[PDB]
Write a protein that binds this ligand. Structure first.
Ligand SMILES: Cc1cc2nc3c(=O)[nH]c(=O)nc-3n(C[C@H](O)[C@H](O)[C@H](O)COP(=O)(O)OP(=O)(O)OC[C@H]3O[C@@H](n4cnc5c(N)ncnc54)[C@H](O)[C@@H]3O)c2cc1C
Ligand SMILES: Cc1cc2nc3c(=O)[nH]c(=O)nc-3n(C[C@H](O)[C@H](O)[C@H](O)COP(=O)(O)OP(=O)(O)OC[C@H]3O[C@@H](n4cnc5c(N)ncnc54)[C@H](O)[C@@H]3O)c2cc1C
Ligand SMILES: NC(=O)c1ccc[n+]([C@@H]2O[C@H](COP(=O)([O-])OP(=O)(O)OC[C@H]3O[C@@H](n4cnc5c(N)ncnc54)[C@H](OP(=O)(O)O)[C@@H]3O)[C@@H](O)[C@H]2O)c1
Ligand SMILES: NC(=O)c1ccc[n+]([C@@H]2O[C@H](COP(=O)([O-])OP(=O)(O)OC[C@H]3O[C@@H](n4cnc5c(N)ncnc54)[C@H](OP(=O)(O)O)[C@@H]3O)[C@@H](O)[C@H]2O)c1
Ligand SMILES: [Mg+2]
Ligand SMILES: [Mg+2]
Lengths: 305, 305
């Protein structure tokens, strides 16, 4: 049995691709992962996804998406794809000891936000720990917060956040920055930003919400505690392109490359959407838009066969 | 008073730009038009916009969008922009006899689907007359329908629709087609498609929903009536770029050109989103995604000033 299309991933890109493909009668087979529902499944309030005047929680929105895909006939499997063979007229995915095949594959595996890996970080996500100033910065008006990282994201997140926060402490594990000179100098000029270089977070403290961070000097080992009510982690993203490395062309940071303003990858019959591709906007609504585009691309390509 | 950003248009692109810009504290000034709310304000059920497992009407979705923009502080004006001056550090829009200025402008004026201009067409939109097989084709399962046009859209719409319809009659006002040979030959090979060349629709009949079309031979003037329950108009789209012609670079069909996979136009400080730009996908979710992108582009550009 060779399916018309297999979708790998269950964030906004994968579910929007599934909705369009199912409504187009392609009977999409979707591998959601065991950690299904994408990045919003791990946040609380989502307020910038257009269509909800009062907002909606991340899990509520993703369940709507999932049930919508189901309603039109998508075959959803809460299983991880462990390996793929994407070259040729029949593509194969391997799920544990099971194999599935399709004429077209839509890659929607997303990108992981890099984690500090310290106690308190996961428990307090959506409770004062955030990965996205555009998403949650609104909620820290007149508060003292930290931003972690030494690249352009950290500089952009920190400077953006000062329109809300009382103060921003930018914490970086060395005394040299990966950020561009422009971004670094913008943060230095900002009166609400204080730098702590050669500093790492070892623990995030929080009653039910963030109350402070434990700090450590990366040179001397000196430790101390900082009272803050928000922590923005901006230490980069890792596109989940491991499955397709060596098959689909990637950029130097591992994002899947696509042709022009389409979702076509370097491989015939293989399309890519969402934060697996986009390292610029990284929002639910942009990922959803690209998932729709991938399914329209796939349907048109399938019609050409 | 010079605003940070003015948004022109109130479809999914303009309202999503407004939500992001307002939540970013840019106090966006949005000119919605007197025919506000974009193309969905004129349809009935919207089922492929991700986030609504049971669907939502077009006006319901657009009102959510509008109230969402309002909630975060967008200044919405139900007025048409009649002229713009987009070059330079301060851009001006003229609304009747009033002028408004901004450092950045987001163009979200959309594209108009071309109309037949015949009695019954407007009254029966959402009631059997459609402009979008991807959107509404689902609803005509086992019905006899028509598609109007002689280009690639008409050929694509007609061939796509045969997975639902009992039959598709493709009506074209001449005996020569603008469609590519591939698209024309795909439609000719399709057993469910019948062509009527040198034929135009003069009236769409419909009790509350489409019941038939009145036809006229464009050579002989012979008229007759065809019993059908759906009419898909696929005679092209006109991007609403008239305001900006001669200021922003356009392609040969009048769509606003943008740089790479961004929303930057040829003019500094001017960004463009939605179906004003995209002549490929033309969905609410893709327009919303690009409106978000335009506001992130604009915010980053403004920060650089
Ligand atoms: C804490 C947090 C809060 C956020 N808040 C907002 C917000 O408020 N508004 C907004 O617009 N954006 C927000 N975002 C960003 C938004 O969630 C992402 O940009 C969006 O989800 C990207 O969607 P995507 O489909 O490309 O990838 P993802 O959301 O990453 O989804 C990918 C899914 O596919 C699964 N998958 C990956 N590989 C496989 C595989 N081999 N096999 C099977 N399944 C696989 C993954 O486990 C995951 O579930 C937030 C992100 C985070 C981390
Ligand atoms: C009948 C119909 C049914 C559809 N059904 C679906 C569906 O079910 N699912 C889906 O995904 N897509 C659907 N679509 C397509 C979808 O609606 C469009 O792709 C989407 O709305 C494009 O949004 P946009 O913001 O770029 O432009 P538009 O929707 O065209 O919005 C532009 C708005 O800006 C206003 N405007 C324009 N110029 C000015 C000006 N100078 N000054 C002030 N205001 C101005 C316009 O009047 C308009 O209100 C449908 C379209 C139609 C016509
Ligand atoms: N110009 C813009 O508008 C803009 C905005 C955002 C991103 N970008 C671009 O996107 C790309 C990636 O940018 P990025 O900032 O997200 O990632 P990045 O350039 O790779 O920098 C990541 C930062 O996080 C630090 N880091 C990584 N893991 C850490 C850990 N466990 N603990 C503490 N610190 C850690 C790194 O420190 P080390 O230096 O020690 O490794 C580094 O400073 C860049 O090319 C950037 O220019 C541009
Ligand atoms: N390959 C694809 O997947 C695909 C899909 C869609 C679109 N496209 C491309 O998009 C571009 C536009 O395509 P399009 O088909 O939307 O528009 P188009 O190429 O301009 O063709 C429009 C058709 O509608 C007819 N028409 C216009 N007004 C009419 C009226 N009032 N009454 C009756 N007929 C009318 C025209 O007839 P006349 O010939 O007499 O003018 C013409 O045949 C093209 O470049 C196309 O290749 C490609
Ligand atoms: Mg996840
Ligand atoms: Mg309209």
């Amino acid at each position: 049995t060779v399916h018309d299309v297999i979708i790998i991933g269950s964030g906004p890109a994968g579910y929007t691709a599934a909705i369009y493909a199912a409504r187009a009668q392609l009977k999409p087979l979707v591998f959601e992962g065991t950690q299904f529902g994408g990045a919003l499944m791990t946040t609380t309030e989502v307020e910038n996804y257009p269509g909800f005047r009062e907002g909606i929680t991340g899990p509520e929105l993703m369940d709507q998406m999932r049930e919508q895909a189901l309603r039109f006939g998508a075959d959803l499997r809460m299983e991880d794809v462990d390996a793929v063979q994407l070259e040729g007229p029949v593509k194969t995915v391997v799920v544990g000891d099971e194999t599935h095949q399709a004429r077209a594959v839509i890659l929607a595996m997303g990108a992981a936000a890099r984690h500090l890996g310290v106690p308190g970080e996961e428990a307090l996500t959506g409770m004062g720990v955030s990965t996205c100033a555009t998403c949650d910065g609104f909620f820290f008006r007149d508060q003292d917060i930290v931003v972690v990282g030494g690249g352009d994201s950290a500089m952009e997140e920190a400077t953006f956040l000062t329109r809300f926060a009382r103060s921003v402490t930018l914490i970086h594990r060395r005394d040299e920055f990966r950020a561009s000179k422009i971004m670094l100098e913008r943060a230095r000029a900002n009166e609400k930003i204080t730098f702590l270089t050669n500093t790492e977070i070892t623990q995030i403290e929080g009653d039910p919400k963030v109350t402070g961070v434990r700090l450590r000097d990366t040179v001397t080992g000196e430790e101390s505690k900082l009272d803050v009510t928000g922590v923005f982690v901006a230490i980069g993203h890792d596109p989940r392109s491991e499955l397709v490395r060596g098959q689909v062309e990637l950029d130097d940071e591992g994002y899947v490359k696509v042709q022009g303003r389409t979702t076509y990858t370097s491989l015939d019959g293989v399309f890519a959407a969402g934060d697996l591709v986009d390292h610029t906007y990284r929002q639910a609504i942009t990922a959803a838009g690209s998932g729709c585009a991938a399914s329209i691309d796939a349907e048109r390509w399938l019609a050409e066969q």
